[PDB]
Structure formats: structure tokens, C-alpha cells
């Protein structure tokens, strides 16, 4: 199928409380596989999935050094941004970076990414062409001019098209048991009386992977989007996700209502009813 690799980085300054907190995590699709945290006692990048543990001490050495370098780069970058935005040295500020690549079924690059944010807003992004920049403001435009002179887009392109894709392919293979397995939702409908006149029908989807799913309620076939309470897809803590959709139904009219589940791990799309 189609897959993705991402590295997320967050630096948070803390004036008067030492150097900024740096936390980076790596993902393949919806699976966390590496992490580094600067406030751990002797920080190293650590595995978080079984298929990455097989990498040699030299992988972990290099990964760790890259993480330390990025933390340090971020510390300086955070000082720089106080200048660009004419800010006081008093407050806490946040620098975020994401980069990675998407591959298709064949394992060819579909799209590469590299983007930064300052204080939770867009700062600068590498465009889909992997050759030009979108700067969100005049401060980011100063970064753009420096990165244009230093030919940074060309360096990111070389990586996003080469190593990112090659190592993602490698991880998909080594992690083929899990990364290439979709777990279908386990589904049921529950009935929650509100009064003698109404009850809540709640349609559960549990234990699914990857996170992407569609839950909708129908009444007689028509769509109840306007009346459906749909909670955010949430992690179960074991690699799988949960979600539910709920409608308030007139007591006795429960069998007019059908819940519909689509998810890639299902042999066929599901249709469910409250089963008293």
C-alpha cells in the first residue's frame, strides 16, 4: 500500500530554567519507532518498535548525534527568532519541525515534506517541488534568503528522494508483520436511555490500525451528520485506535438506524444495528 515516514521535533525555551527542552519522535505511518528526549539522564535515541532494534550500534550512535545537533541548532534558532520578532528574553517560545516522505504501493516517492513552525504558527515550508520555499512572513523571508543562498532545498531534495525512501522501504520490510497489517475495527452498538422518550445509540469501533476510519449513522438510509456526535479518533495505547459515533433516537425507532464502518482491514465494509 501507500506508506509514510516522519520525524517530528519540538524545542521549547525555558528562560531561567536552563536550555530548551528538545523532544523528537520518528513515525512510520501511525507507528512510533524512535524517540529522543533531552531531559532524560544520558539522552540517546531509543527504539519504540521491535523492527528497529535490529539496527547496529552505529545507527544509534549516528541517530543520537543528529538529535544532539538538532537540539543545539534549535537553541540558536530560538535566540535568532527573538531578534526577528523583536521579542523579550523573558518568555517561553516553541520551535517545531517536521520532515519526511510518502511512498506509493511500488515504493516510489509520492511527496517529500519539510516545514517549520514558530509559536504554533507556520514559519517556513519546503514546497512540493522540493526546490522552492513558502515563508509565512517577513521574518521567515530572512530565513528563506539564507536557505536560498546556502542551497538548502537541494540538500533536502537529495535526502527526501534518496535516503528517506530507501530507509522507509527497509523499515516496511523489517516491520512487515505490523507495518503491513491493517487491524479491522471491532464493532458494536450500545443503547443509552436518556428518558422514556429518547435514547442514545453509540456505535463503537475499537482495536483498529491504522487510525484512518469512517463512522457514520444512517436513518432509513439518509445521512445523520448534523445529529451525530463524533469523537476524535483516540489511541488505545497498544498500537490501535478507538472511535465512536452517537445519535439521539426516539424510543422504539432504533431499527430505523444503521451504523456504517469503513476501514482498510475490513474484508467488507460493515453495517450494524442495535441488538437488544
Amino acid at each position: 500500500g501507500s506508506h509514510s515516514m516522519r520525524y517530528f521535533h519540538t524545542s521549547v525555551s525555558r528562560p531561567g530554567r536552563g536550555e530548551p527542552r528538545f523532544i523528537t519522535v520518528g513515525y512510520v505511518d501511525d507507528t512510533l519507532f524512535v524517540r529522543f528526549d533531552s531531559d532524560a539522564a544520558s539522552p540517546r535515541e531509543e527504539p519504540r518498535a521491535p523492527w528497529i532494534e535490529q539496527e547496529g550500534p552505529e545507527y544509534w550512535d549516528r541517530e543520537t548525534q543528529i538529535c544532539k545537533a538538532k537540539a543545539q541548532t534549535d537553541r540558536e534558532d530560538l535566540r535568532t527568532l527573538l531578534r526577528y520578532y523583536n521579542q523579550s528574553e523573558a518568555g517561553s517560545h516553541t520551535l517545531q519541525n517536521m520532515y519526511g516522505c510518502d511512498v506509493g504501493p511500488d515504493g516510489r516517492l509520492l511527496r517529500g515534506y519539510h516545514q517549520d513552525a514558530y509559536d504554533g504558527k507556520d514559519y517556513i515550508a519546503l514546497n512540493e517541488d522540493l526546490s522552492s520555499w513558502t515563508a509565512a512572513d517577513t521574518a521567515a523571508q530572512i530565513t528563506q534568503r539564507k536557505w536560498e543562498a546556502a542551497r538548502v532545498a537541494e540538500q533536502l531534495r537529495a535526502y527526501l528522494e534518496g535516503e528517506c525512501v530507501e530507509w522507509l522501504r527497509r523499515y516496511l520490510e523489517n516491520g512487515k508483520e505490523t507495518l503491513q497489517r491493517a487491524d479491522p475495527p471491532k464493532t458494536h452498538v450500545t443503547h443509552h436511555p436518556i428518558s422514556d422518550h429518547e435514547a442514545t445509540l453509540r456505535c463503537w469501533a475499537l482495536g483498529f490500525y491504522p487510525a484512518e476510519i469512517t463512522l457514520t449513522w444512517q436513518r432509513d438510509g439518509e445521512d445523520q451528520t448534523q445529529d451525530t456526535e463524533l469523537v476524535e479518533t483516540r489511541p488505545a495505547g497498544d498500537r490501535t485506535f478507538q472511535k465512536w459515533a452517537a445519535v439521539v433516537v426516539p424510543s422504539g425507532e432504533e431499527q430505523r438506524y444503521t451504523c456504517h464502518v469503513q476501514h482498510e482491514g475490513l474484508p467488507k465494509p460493515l453495517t450494524l444495528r442495535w441488538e437488544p
Binding site: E63, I66, C67, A69, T73, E76, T80, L156
Partner: peptide, 9 residues
């Protein structure tokens, strides 16, 4: 694996 990052804002 990661990309080394060799530029500043």
C-alpha cells in the same frame, strides 16, 4: 533514518 541538519534560521 534521520537527515543531518546543516543550516540555521
Amino acid at each position: 533514518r534521520r537527515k543531518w541538519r546543516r543550516w540555521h534560521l
